[PDB]
Each structure stands twice: as structure tokens, then as C-alpha cells.
Symmetry: C2
Subunit: 633 residues, 2 copies
Amino acid sequence: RLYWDDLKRKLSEKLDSTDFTSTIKLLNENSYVPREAGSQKDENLALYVENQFREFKLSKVWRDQHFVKIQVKDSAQNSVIIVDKNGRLVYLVENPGGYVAYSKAATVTGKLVHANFGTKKDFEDLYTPVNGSIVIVRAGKITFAEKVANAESLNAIGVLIYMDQTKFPIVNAELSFFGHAHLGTGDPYTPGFPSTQFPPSRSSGLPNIPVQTISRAAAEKLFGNMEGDCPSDWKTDSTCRMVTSESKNVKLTVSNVLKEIKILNIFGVIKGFVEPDHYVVVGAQRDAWGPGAAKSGVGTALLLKLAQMFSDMVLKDGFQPSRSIIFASWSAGDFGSVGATEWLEGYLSSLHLKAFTYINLDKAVLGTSNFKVSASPLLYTLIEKTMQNVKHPVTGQFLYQDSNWASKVEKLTLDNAAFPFLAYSGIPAVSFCFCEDTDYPYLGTTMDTYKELIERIPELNKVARAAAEVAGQFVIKLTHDVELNLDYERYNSQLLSFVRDLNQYRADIKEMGLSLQWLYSARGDFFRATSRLTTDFGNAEKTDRFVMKKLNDRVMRVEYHFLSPYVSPKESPFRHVFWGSGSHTLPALLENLKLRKQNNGAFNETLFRNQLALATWTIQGAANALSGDVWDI
Amino acid sequence: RLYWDDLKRKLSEKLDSTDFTSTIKLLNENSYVPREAGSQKDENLALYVENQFREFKLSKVWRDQHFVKIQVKDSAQNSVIIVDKNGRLVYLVENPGGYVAYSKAATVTGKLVHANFGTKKDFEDLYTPVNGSIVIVRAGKITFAEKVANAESLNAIGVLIYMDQTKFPIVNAELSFFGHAHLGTGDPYTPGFPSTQFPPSRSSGLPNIPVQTISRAAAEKLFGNMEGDCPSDWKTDSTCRMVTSESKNVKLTVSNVLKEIKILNIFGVIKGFVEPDHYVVVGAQRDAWGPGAAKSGVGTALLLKLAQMFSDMVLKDGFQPSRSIIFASWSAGDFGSVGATEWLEGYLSSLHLKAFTYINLDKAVLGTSNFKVSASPLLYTLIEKTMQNVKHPVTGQFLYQDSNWASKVEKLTLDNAAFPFLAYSGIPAVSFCFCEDTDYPYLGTTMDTYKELIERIPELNKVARAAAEVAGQFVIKLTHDVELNLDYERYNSQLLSFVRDLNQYRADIKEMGLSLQWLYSARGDFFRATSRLTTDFGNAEKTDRFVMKKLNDRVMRVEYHFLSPYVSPKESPFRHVFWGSGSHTLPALLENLKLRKQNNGAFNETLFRNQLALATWTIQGAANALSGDVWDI
């Protein structure tokens, strides 16, 4: 067993002589260049990664194979067409190079209406009714899946998406791009039974309208046939317009088809010396529509180098992780973390007893200016201590520069592979990156190349190196300390913050005959439960692996006990009342209640009483799950 | 620490000098005599039990209080009336002394039709259509809740239930009786929010028709006005008839009302010396409609004596249970294990990590001829070894007399408090009793008295003594051995048996384009997972509480991982794919498939493909949950 100081030094010095850019460049070679999930090139890289793991001599390397239905574009072209309502003659504007996976295959003709980013707010602020019209929106702010849903929610009949030059200062205006519009993760077409025969989807999260990505040039050509200046508030090109002329409307034809593919998740593992049946999981997306250097290459490179380093530290330098470290190369990430989700779904309710943390490595390097982090609050302390002794690659200062960084942390979103881990599986998760206030413009394009990457970021090797150090320090701390570096006390602030918000309606809870007393008591009981647990840790003999096991297991279950037990994972997979999606999340409870100031019928008093109940029960249950022995109350 | 041989002797000799009949008699005194749930007498007994626990000096004794809505009969009498369709004049036949909790409060008039036991089969074998008619059925075979559901399922408008003299050779034909018809357990009116305001119930399992219990005399008076002899196949009184005369039909008026009551679950605990945060739970129903000597008294008596004995063994004789023993006195058992279920529901998904076994003590003594057992397969080995060294109270031979007893074991039913533990909470459970091939006739009547009990069973003290020895040996084995006496290998036979059944349709699975290959692989993987676990146990150092903790925790999770993760506990609480209720259970999958030999539209091919899928996923998940470390595959 080594000292944390030595492990820190060892990791750092191994990192010093590590060549990241070579690997990123290597992954950008023609053997791997265009690696859409399931393709032979994806399969090539999968084989290469797998071989590398074998050369690193990890305890065991294996395959997690899955068959899934994705959507690819048909031999028939998707098309964007302008129609003259006079005589109904059509003019072809574009056959897009790209497409949007999970779009309804359909042909729709209507008026075209701009809706900015297609955010929920953008739609309400519209002075043009979207109903029965095709909508065009800029990429960014929110996922394609959300834009489609918001629009579909207002009865739009189709969606176009372009990259405006203000948000995406790309010289080539003919660039086409890719994404998906499945409002979830995993395979949307997952019949619980094999079939020839065709069953409907139900609560799939799939679009019922066609959605399609277009080049900025094609959008500006559409603007050429539209009227109305865009609000300066949108801060967009002067090109932009709002609505088709009276005599014209647009026709969209999407003919994407379902294809079944064989994806491979490639796994390596360094077994733990004390509790090998518990693991930290480190993963990266291996697939990409185009070259996907930043989208896929960076992550896969870090995955490979981290795996190599840790294998060397165990075999040469005497590092002895208490718990196991699993390295995961995912496929079909581009379709909604499909690879990751399929694997997660094998262990719906059991995984949280083995995996205590997931570290995502996707898009860790996109810029230089900033260091962003999204994570479970359970990892805020680990993250903080890690930023306090990792240096900025350009700047030289420690990453930790703001004592208040934790309150400004944004939550994991659906397009992040870290999301299903936290919100569906109840495993604390963290994603982080070096970046700007600007999205990396080339993501999802054929311009996401190494050359492009090394050009916007000439210090690529140093920056990737800093990204590896944070992930590496995470992984060491997590498998070295006898306690788990999961700060369960953090959820007191979260509950406090939530009740603090809720208490801004102590009046409206009166006019409904409701007391919030049982909820306050749940919050109090959780506080007590954490306090007792901290005391127990302090009074425990750190060398007694039996008592630590027992205390650590309690910590490992905190996250999962915030998954609502009162909703089916099939109907709503994202059960986490803090971080998931649906009417069972604390945020939903607040939004339903904010709709009570308006005397409009949007408020749903009944729903709220149920939400209040389920929240209280969930929180009580978590407090009770943490308290320990049934005679201690 | 003592030797199993000494603990066996100690338990036995303490039992030898234990006076059971005194306690049963004591519970039959006027201070407790009629103790309907929530009543003052129930509350008296609750206080007495609680005091006794305090005198026994258990580690901690506490209260688990709940407010629940039960139904009691109104000041207005329920009535059974015969109507002359000529002139519509009515004749009062009875104002029943008893009632059926959860009956719809309503008045209905129609023809009366006998349907034997009201089993699903009994209805199909009817040559008289039940639709729009009131139905009369004999008690027995199935719960009232099922009879009502089956009848309601065929559009009957009301249900009468009597005790025929063949199944219930009771001299007094005027005897009235009680039960409930809620097709589940727990409080059916559980709004997730407090209210004045009234919300509908939804998937409550509540009757939409009136149901009422009548005396045999009242039934025979009804038969007096009916025609058609009953099938000799029913083996019932010659009195019985099938249908009202042309000119007559029956009117039923039920006016039961909802009352909110305060129930108390009384708990005692003897803390474990090694893992106190894990418990065996031993419970008994304290409430009864009448005197409920057999229904409630026996169980509560055993609960008290067991608690006392084990407290003495810990404090005087040096017994040191590894894990905790909790003694539970439940209330509102008579309404569907309501007390038990309410408590279970506080720990929906967390309880199975603390409670590894529930032993039910209800109706353990009803006769002398037989010893019956129902339980999770996880306890078959414990049960067997226990029968191999417990003697029959009358006979003197060991209870174990049939090497094949396990394949003839009937599953826990809904009226058993052991049921929600296993099927809703995923905690292995066992109920057992000494009994006959005949139901104890006085259950749910005012004749369930000590005097009646001591009369049909003069060896009451000896028989109760044998009942305590099995429960006691269960409890000792379970808290003494370093391994858990949960035989997880047993579920290989279960899966085998199930697939063996399913394989009787390998043809019909072809005509649907389906392979069963992924299901076979799940079964294989579970087999592997258990084999590996047995090996691990063998290779473990029995004195290393850390490794044992880890292996025992894996065993403790087997049961729960058979709860279907794909159904909400609110919509269907009984999620256990082997032992629960609904379309997600393996049995349901078989029944849907047996409906494919008939070319009638009852078969539901789509449903089956989903069932096949969910089953496969559930089983795979359980196998994967058992395999241990993610690098072991």
C-alpha cells in the first residue's frame, strides 16, 4: 500500500511523458475515420481498443454485445423543397448530407416558422402560431429531441434545424450535420419480446413528426423566401426571417430507415484488492457520425491512456486499488448513449450495489478558457479537492478559483452518457471538460477532425493531459481512501434549497388544506441520518474492513434511494427526483405550483397533492434507509 | 458463543415448561374479547403486549402507528330481502350480524344464482348466466376478494356468501361471520396526498358491487325459494338450489361506512451481536372481529412466549444472535394484513436489505392431523432440517415424513400476512400450521373462542408448543449460522420447472417467429451465478465477517431481484414474478399461452412477446445481480 502523495506524484509523472495527440491522430486515420455505430470502422476501432486493453494486461477484458435498432438515411434522398401555393410547383433547395436519427419517416407540406432555439419559452414568445406549420430552429441551447418535443407539443408538423453563423462561425455554409431526436436514451424500439410481426411503441419518446438538419446555406435560401425580421433579442444573423411569404410554403421529405446493428461495448477491468465486487466506471463514446475527433476521439484516447497508466501503476509501481476500476468503450453514443444504456438496463436495480461512481470522458477537451463540471452532489467534494491540486494547462493556476463553484454547477443533460447512470441507475456520475462559452462548432459534422482540433487548440496534448489528471485523481481517490469519497451530506443543502423554494408558497398550501409538516420531518430525518452516519464513520476503526464495508455500503445506496420507487422505469426511466425527468421530480412539483399564480387552468391541484405525497415518501424512505439499525430511531 | 446442540436443547427445555393455553385463555378475557382493529380492546391488548415486551427486557420496544380507513357496518342494518316480481312486495329474510369489509355500499335487486365457491372454473361450468344477477356462493377454496372479482368479472350485481354445513359442520345455523373483499393488502384508500375533498380510487382492487355474508339458515331460506338441484360434484347439502323461481328475485342492501382508525403495530427487538442492522422478523395478527382465539390469540400467544424465551436465552443462557430478531404484533390483519402492509410500505425498496426473513405465526394451530407449510423456496432447506428434528405433538414421530414434501408445497395466498413480505417486499417468508384437511370452521365468527379451541384440540398446549419449536428453531438457525440459511440454489428447480412447462409449446413459439434462446441463456446464467456463489462460500474463511457479510448480502438480494423492475408497485404491488399477481408473473405468461390452443380471441400474441421479454430481462438481471464482480463473466 502506497501513500496518497506518492500516487499523486506517480500519476502526474506518468502523465508528463504521455503522448495524447498521437493517439487522437491515430484514431483519425482512414481505418477508423468515419465510424458510425455498428459500421465496420466502428468495429475496427472496437477491435483495436480491445487489443490495446489486452496489451495493457488488465485483469480481464470482455465484450458486451447488443443488437439494437438505429435509423440511418435511405438510398432515397431527404429533401427540402419550396412550394408555390399558386399551381403547386416545387423547387428543390437541398438534399441534406446529414439527417436526424429517430425522425418520423414522412412527407409534410406547410408554412415555415422560425422559433429561434425552439425552447419552451421561444415558442410562447412567438406572435406567429406554430400550429399546422413546419418550424425552423437554430441548433444549440437544448437537444434536438427537446426542440422536436416542444414543437410537437404545439402541433408543428415538422422541424428543420440549422447552425446559424452567430452561434457557429463556420466558414463553409454548405456543411451538413447529424444528431438524434429521441427524447431519452437507449434503444427506443425495445420490445420486451422477440417477434415479421410489428408492435406499436407507446411511451417511447419518439417524434411523430419529420425532423431534418440543413446547411446554413439552405436555411438562408429559405430565408430568402420569408418575411419578418428576427428579434434583435435572438442575437442572430441579419439573414434570418420569421415566416414564409403568403404565396409560398415549404415541403420536407424524410425517408430514413430502421436498421438493426451489432454494437460492441468494450470493457477492461483492473480488479480491486479489497472489494473487487465494487467498481468505479470510466467510460467514453467510441462511435461518431463523421470523424468525430472531439466527439469521440479525445474521449477514446483518454480512455486508452488512462487504462494504460493505471495498469502500469498496479503492475510496476505498487498501486493497489481497494475497489475495481472498469474502463468502458461505448458504441452508439451518437444515438443517445445507446451502448451505455443497454448495458445499464441489464442491471436496472442491482447495478448501484456494485458501481459507486461513473466518470464520463466524452468531449473533455473542446477549448481552453474554462473548466466545466456536471455531477451528482455526492462528488462535489472530490471534484473540489481535485481542482485544488490540478493546474490549468495554459494558465498554470489551480483549476479551483471560485469558492462558490458548486452553486453554479449545471445538471447533467440527456445528451450526456453520465445522465442515464445518475438518473436511471442511481450511480453518482461526473462529466467535465475544458471549453469556452461557445459550443464546439464542428460537433456532429465531417469537420470534427484532428486537424481542426489541433488547430483551434495547439496545446491539445497539455490540455488532454490535464483532463486525464482530473479523471485519474478521481479514480485514485475513489479506490484508495478507506471511506468512499461520496459526500452524502451534500444532499442536505439540496433538500434545504428545495424546501426553501417550496416555502415560498406556504400560503397556497393553506388554501388547499395541506400541511407541509410531514415533508419538513422527512428533511429533518435525512439530516439526522447523515449526522449519525458521519459520527459512525468517525467512531469506526479505519482498519476494520467489516465495519467500513457496512458504512461504505450505506453510502453507496444514498444516490439510488432518490430514485422514485413509485414510477415504472419503463414509463419513466429517469426516476431520480432531483435529476430525472417527469412529474415525480422535485422540479416538476415546483413548476406545477408556480402555475397557480395564473388563474388559468394549467395548475393541477390534485397532481400536486400526489406529488407532495410521493416526494415526502421518497425522502422519508431515503432518510430511513440511511438510519441503519431498526432499533435506532 | 454456544453450540447449535446446546441452543436446540435450551430452546426445547424452556418450551417444555412453557404454558401456552394460559396465555391463549388470558387473551380471551373480556378486556380483550371482541377486539376489532382500532377498537379500545384492540388498543388494550396492544398496550398489554407492549408492556410484556418491556418486562421481557428486549433491546428496544416501540410503536408503529398508522391512520387507515377501514369499513364497519352502519347503524342502519344490512338486509337480505326476497321480492315478489308480482306487485314488488318485499319480505325481510335477515339482518346479518356480520358483514364484508370493503363491500360497495349499495342496494341491488335481481335474480339469485348459485355459483358454488365462485371460483373462476365454477362460473364457466354454469348453465345459468350470472350477468345482471346477484350471486350466492359458499365460503372456502378462495378468498372473498377473489369470489367478488370473479363474479364482478361476469357482471354479477351482488354477492352473498354462506357457510354450507358440508364444509362447515357448525351446529348453530344462525351464526354470522366476517371477512373482506379487497383484492390486495393494505389500505385501499391511500391517497398519496392529504385532503373534505374526495378523489376516486383507480387501481384499488375494491369491489364495485355489494357483497354480504349470511347465516346458513338465511341461505337455506333463500334455497326454499329457488329451483334446480345442485350438481353432486359440488358435494354440498341437499338443501342447496341453483336459481330463484320465475316470480321471485332477491334484494341486497349493504350500507357499511368508512371509518378512520388508529392502529398500532407493536414491535420488540433483540439486537444482533454481529450484524444488528439485519433482522429476522416474527409477526402475528393481534386483531379479530370476534374473540378470534384461533385467528388471533394463538399467534399472539406464540409471539409473546417466543419473545420471552429468546429474551431469557440471551440474558441468562448466553445465546448471542448474530443478527437481530424483531417481534411484531400487527393490527388490522382482519382487513388484509393492513398493519403489516402499511409498515412494509415505508420501506418499499429498502426493506429487503435489512429484513432477510419473515416468519408468520397466524393460525399456526387449527388441528392435529397435519403440518402444512407455505414459503419462499429459499427456506425449503431450513424448513426441512427443522421438520427433521421437531416431533409431532400427538404422534411422536418427526414432522418430516415425506422426502418429496417440497414439490407439494402450495404458495402463499393473499389472506396471509406472509404474502406481502414475499411478493411485495421481496423478503423470503414462511407460514406453517398444524391443521386438518378441513378449514377451521369458526374462523371469522363469534364462536372462535378459547373454549371452542380447547375442545376440538385438548392437546392445545402441546401443539402450540410444537408450533413454537419450529418457529424458534427457524429463528435460531437464522441468527446463529455464519451463512444465511437461505437456499438460493432452490430457484434453479423453479426456473427449470417453469422453462420445462414453457417448452411444451416450442411449436407455438415457432409460428410466432420467436426464439426462446435468450431465456434459456438467462436460466443458464442464473445457474452459473448460484454455482459460483456456492464455490465462493466454500472457499471463504467462515471467521472473516467481512467476506461473509459480502457473500451474505448477495444471498439477501436474491429474493428481491425476482420482483419485476418493469411494473409500478402502486399499479401492481405484487411484483414477484414467481409469487406475485398480474401479467408480469411467470404463471400469467403460461396462462396466456395456454389460451392459444383454443382458436378463440382470448390469446394475446402481443402481450406474450412482451411477457417473454420482461421475464427474460428479469431473470437475466437476477443472474447478473448474483454473479458478483463485473469482471467475472
